[PDB]
Design a protein around this ligand. Structure first.
Ligand SMILES: Cc1n[nH]c(C)c1-c1cccc2c(CCCOc3cccc4ccccc34)c(C(=O)O)[nH]c12
Ligand SMILES: Cc1n[nH]c(C)c1-c1cccc2c(CCCOc3cccc4ccccc34)c(C(=O)O)[nH]c12
Length: 150
C-alpha cells in the first residue's frame, strides 16, 4: 500500500522531529522528493496551525488519557469520528497531523516517547481509511504540496 507507506513516512517523520527537535537523516523510500516538500510544507504550515489553535489543542489534549498502546488505539475512535464529520479539504488534513505533532510533543515530555510511533500509525490509518478516494483524486502528497505552495 504505497499511499499508506508514503503517508506514514511523512507523518512519522513530522511527529518525531516535532517531539525531539532533531531531523531524521535516514534516507527516504521512493517518492522521497515529494515526501521532502511535504515535510517542508508541514514545518511551515503545521507549526503555525499548532500556534494558531493552541487553546483548542490544549483543551483536546486534556480530554485524552494515553497510558499505553491500547489507549493509543482507543484514540482512533475519537479521531475517526471528529475527522469524518464535516467538509473534506487539505486544512482538515493538516489539522489532523498538526494535532498529532502537538500530542507527540506532550508524550515525549511525560516519558512516553514510545507511544509516538503507534500514534503516527493510528493517524495514518485513519487518514487513508477515511479519505483514500479523495486523496487519490487530489494527487496525494503532490496535491498537498501544491495546495500550500508559495
Ligand atoms: C476554509 C476552511 N474551512 N474549514 C477548514 C478546515 C478550512 C481550511 C482550508 C485550507 C487550509 C486551512 C488551514 C491551514 C492554515 C491556513 O492555510 C494555509 C496556510 C498557508 C498557505 C496557504 C495557502 C493556500 C491556502 C491555505 C493556506 C486551517 C487551519 O489551520 O485552521 N483551516 C483551513
Ligand atoms: C476540539 C477543537 N476545537 N477547535 C479545533 C481546531 C479542535 C481540534 C482539536 C484537535 C484535533 C482536531 C481535528 C482533527 C480530527 C481529530 O483529530 C484527533 C482527535 C483526537 C485525538 C487525536 C490524536 C492525534 C491526532 C489527531 C487526533 C479537527 C478537525 O478534523 O476539524 N479539529 C480538531
Amino acid at each position: 500500500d504505497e499511499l499508506y507507506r508514503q503517508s506514514l513516512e511523512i507523518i512519522s517523520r513530522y511527529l518525531r522531529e516535532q517531539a525531539t527537535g532533531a531531523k531524521d537523516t535516514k534516507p527516504m523510500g521512493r517518492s522521497g522528493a515529494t515526501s521532502r516538500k511535504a515535510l517542508e510544507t508541514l514545518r511551515r504550515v503545521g507549526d503555525g496551525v499548532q500556534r494558531n489553535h493552541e487553546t483548542a489543542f490544549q483543551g483536546m489534549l486534556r480530554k485524552l488519557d494515553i497510558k499505553n498502546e491500547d489507549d493509543v488505539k482507543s484514540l482512533s475512535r475519537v479521531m475517526i469520528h471528529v475527522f469524518s464529520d464535516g467538509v473534506t479539504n487539505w486544512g482538515r488534513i493538516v489539522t489532523l497531523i498538526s494535532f498529532g505533532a502537538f500530542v507527540a510533543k506532550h508524550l515525549k515530555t511525560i516519558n512516553q516517547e514510545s507511544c509516538i510511533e503507534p500514534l503516527a500509525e493510528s493517524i495514518t490509518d485513519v487518514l487513508v481509511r477515511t479519505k483514500r478516494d479523495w486523496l487519490v483524486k487530489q494527487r496525494g502528497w503532490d496535491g498537498f504540496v501544491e495546495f500550500f505552495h508559495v
